């Protein structure tokens, strides 16, 4: 018996309600009862073409936490003087005969999808492929909202900053859309607003949403407050300076906050949250990435093991 | 504290909001004096419950200097103090430019790590006071050029 | 002697009505009759703190046409007076004592205005200070329109592409706003719509304007088509691909366009103008750049020479 | 001209050195009490010059917290007023730790662009002191720190 | 029972005589009796922000020698174009929930001290933080002097080369200062001399020291001869050429050497020791770094294990 | 005709007493009355093997003031004649046949002297050959002192900052030593004390000198304050922070300083001069750099032109 054994795991759209609930329940079971010899005698590659530091160590920790070995590389922005190395179909093919699974991060979008048929029966997990969203980040986001609020249904989840380009928020809205009753706020400037394809998905499923101007306008009723990257190399420095005024979450805009509210963040951060919201009960974004150990551990045990009794 | 006043020439203002007295004695540099400094910070003085004040003996302030209070202390005044009397309690007023007391929001502004003085232009809209930058020439709302 | 004698060319806003028509007339007079040795025994520093081989070859050419010496550089990402340890104010305090005038291009905004404060009696011409101003580009733009159409009023001009961040199109809309009867058609995507502040000063002077979605609508009635520069790095590569249609300008779109109509471009093109447009008589972006040497020759001879006999 | 200058419950002595009262305002953030307060700069003092009479009301300052003042001002001793009534004398005796105020002169230190509270051990040194860092572990003089 | 279980280990000043003797005795016990399954099911990060090749592989070998897994990175001098990544408090926090211990090397000094409270109950070992000395190098230095000479007390330990900036020698003198009877020689040029804070520590504890001109002046009585890096990018090339004449240890200045004398070096080396002192009985700096496997293995077993029976 | 006709300006030591007062007089004569076309039909190569936009703009400016052509480059870390495969001697053998004179700046010492051996009848002026010499900087230093004070003798000059490695202050102490009655106050830290070899030649000529620890002592009696350049990379950043006090020069230290006193600086400043010093009349480092064009104009016109009518 196995649903997600030897599966693709490339995008969140492929995963249904029954796929997300198996990874969250398995992440709560291995956290409550670690199995350090589950993936023993099984090698996993960590082929990070795009250099992500935090994402590679949250994955390689989860590999070593089940007792598997690791073989990985990290290129520091390659494409030196035009033409470089091999093709990506030629790399995955030779890496596939070496190991039992691949965990690849690519700057170009559609790289994880290019590796399913070429790998054969070797599964390939997507750790972030360009602007085609980050599904492992979406799984540890749902796991943090479930373990604190008590559920994933009937929650007041707000989303601040980069919504147009912020990939981590796009599929966080589509994952929560599969759950019912979820109210949605979208606090963003008139530029970095949520796209029309996400808003049309919410109108189709009868899910209520609304655009807001700032944090304090929705602060009275919120169970989660997802906060995004918003990098300076995106909108020009004059535009970034003007809008970034009310959108930053100071500790002064937490007086209406509920007792069970929890601020999240995919990371990193710099000019969205200051360093005085860490000494609160609402601080819950550092241990969200630590909860990503259990989300990527549950996602690796399901694919590299026939059946499991936690 | 309702009787005082009329001590040493100069002048004193009234109606400084709460928490506006402090940080005004610094942005405009006024602590750098060797005479009668008795600020009235954090002391109600009328209709509102929280208000602050500041007094200065022999030390006048150009109309332009007083007008540079408006932005911060919009509801205050200036009555030339000498000794029992008063010569026009001129309230502050939004100046046509504010320099030496505002940083530009445009991080890529030449004026930030350079050996020059700041300077902005003034104009109200209806919602905020957009002060324009002298160098980069980009315009911002007072609320943004204020803090960050 | 000469209203623009020993003046700084930092912004288009500083230049009044008769200021712009005075350098326009001087560019048409020097073009009609060369001034081989007008600025003889005058040294001019070409201090380009930002690399730009287009503008630096056009400026230094015009220095040499009046018979003036030149001594400059190109920071080219390193420059000796940088990396924290030397202010721009110190650099101009030294270069001022060396030369009679300073043409400088800085990546930061307000760099040219800062130079005037430490220059003293040395004029300072702005070759492009970040996303702020570019009056030298605007002087050759209007001079190219004044030759072809014959005037700077009652013209049906339109600006395509990136109008949101395009500093060249911002200063051009303000310079043509100093004239009367001009009709504007700002043809851009919604993500690169012309800023509200430019639409505010137009509304103040009673100047007509209208936002379309393509050139197809207005091509019947236009005397100029100032196609602007659009960066791939301004937005996503996906939403750049779509919505860019009809901002590409094919030569098969010049069917019903007016006979006197002339297509202008700042100069760096790739997508926004097709190669088949070059053969048509409409194309006038290489002749615009050639007229850029006369606009910069008029600026230098008017600031260094006391009179302008011819 | 009368002077019934306000001295309510809480803390404070006068007699603090020249151009030091405003230096004991921004740094320790005594204005951030956000309640009720008053000052007295450039005032006749007891056994020396002039200046300083800082803060008041609901601000009990600890023994080790008034030791923090010692380094800056060696000219004070807390008054726990009740009714013109002087009580509980405690002198700036110089502490073994100094936190939150000073900066590490070392540029390569990693306490400058981080969310931390500074820390500085202290030992005597011929009428002066040497403030060592907890992070940098480089012993600096207590004189070049005032210049930054 | 546990003294150093879940301890800081950041600087040598925090470690007393009873802390140094527990790490040296445990290093002699695991060398005599390897335990390849001590740290089993325990992950250790190796977060080398500053790229040190030899120091990272002496640490990661000791991790794998006890049976622990490893997750590490190495940045090749980052700070590209000004502003880069996250803060160091934001990195350690997210890395702390992943693993059971951190082993960090940072170019800036005070980085290891910044990570103790942020990591929580997760210990963090200092592998070299700027010019705030290298404590793991000091532990393998003491282990080599103990295993050959027979003790750490009453020894004639000389120190050559960079003493002012040489961090590895600073705390080697402070560690040996906790032991008694240790005579000290400081053979260094008039530039790179030992600082006044180290010499004043030696006057306080009644420890005898003296400045010498060259190797041959002290060679008659020496049990150890610690030799330092002395890099060319420190003192200018003319100054480095002149002084470097007698300070270099040739094989010609080993005729007065005792039968139990042993030359040490933290590494690397180039222009301090030539390659003809390797074929001697006094050669003992290559296997000193190999003794650093046992010094970092004893230091990892004490912190990640309640009690131990070797 | 002309004692300095067709001579090499490699070192300050080569220049005799009347040599330095001859180029000083020629710099005061050309400043009094421009020589627009003295070096007409003369080409001069500005071969800067080390990047320096300060000195290269000052040298090339003075070439253009006498009406002389220019053709040069800036190695800028790559240059075509390098990377092992082309000697400096070959480069000068070719450049000599092209031009009438060669101004070269090399990072290596003795590069300008090596160029004279392969130049032939082509003069060779040294713009800065490593840490060896910089006579062009010393010519504008003395010329700035001869204008303000009116003489080069009986002056109370002092040199602050890095005197140990400062090549500008070394050659300045030797050039002012060629005059009589000069009093020297070398105000530096102990780590950057003036070399003994400079204190040896002063003792030979019977010239008084004294080492202080700060400017506070000698500020009462000084006619010049030649503040030198100090690199952060010369020493630690910790011992740079402390001990640097009173070598920073605030404008609040010019209370008792003489009225005729003038502060000089080579030109690159950051720490050693505060910005409040600019407003005072003492500050004369920007006027020193402006006088650097006349010292380099006197050098070129004296080496290429046979006579010096005026
Ligand atoms: Zn600005
Ligand atoms: Zn520090």
Swiss-Prot record, chains A, C, E, F:
Cysteines joined through disulfide linkages = none
Residues involved in carbamoyl phosphate binding: 54-55, 105, 134, 137, 267-268
| Superkingdom | Bacteria
Supply the alphabetized keyword list. Answer: Pyrimidine biosynthesis, Transferase
| Gene Ontology annotations of biological process type | 'de novo' pyrimidine nucleobase biosynthetic process; 'de novo' UMP biosynthetic process; glutamine metabolic process; protein homotrimerization
Q: Where does L-aspartate bind?
A: 84, 167, 229
Key word tRNA processing present in the record?
no
Q: Known PROSITE patterns for this protein?
A: CARBAMOYLTRANSFERASE
EC main class here is transferase
Q: What is its EC number?
A: 2.1.3.2
As for family, the record states: Belongs to the aspartate/ornithine carbamoyltransferase superfamily. ATCase family.
Task: Spell out the protein name for this chain.
Answer: Aspartate carbamoyltransferase catalytic subunit
The species this protein was found in: Escherichia coli (strain K12)
Curated annotation (Swiss-Prot), chains B, D:
Assembly description: Heterododecamer (2C3:3R2) of six catalytic PyrB chains organized as two trimers (C3), and six regulatory PyrI chains organized as three dimers (R2).
Keywords, A to Z, come to: Metal-binding, Pyrimidine biosynthesis, Zinc
Protein name as annotated: Aspartate carbamoyltransferase regulatory chain
Q: What superkingdom does the record give?
A: Bacteria
Key word Zinc present: yes
Q: Which InterPro entries match?
A: Asp_carbamoyltransf_reg_N (IPR020545), Asp_carbamoylTrfase_reg (IPR002801), Asp_carbamoyltrfase_reg_C (IPR020542), Asp_carbatrfase_reg_C_sf (IPR036792), Asp_carbatrfase_reg_N_sf (IPR036793)
Name the Gene Ontology biological process terms: 'de novo' pyrimidine nucleobase biosynthetic process; pyrimidine nucleotide biosynthetic process
Could you say which cofactors this protein requires?
Zn(2+)
Q: Which family does it belong to?
A: Belongs to the PyrI family.
Q: Name one GO molecular function term.
A: zinc ion binding
Residues that bind Zn(2+) = 104, 109, 133, 136
Note on cofactor: Binds 1 zinc ion per subunit.
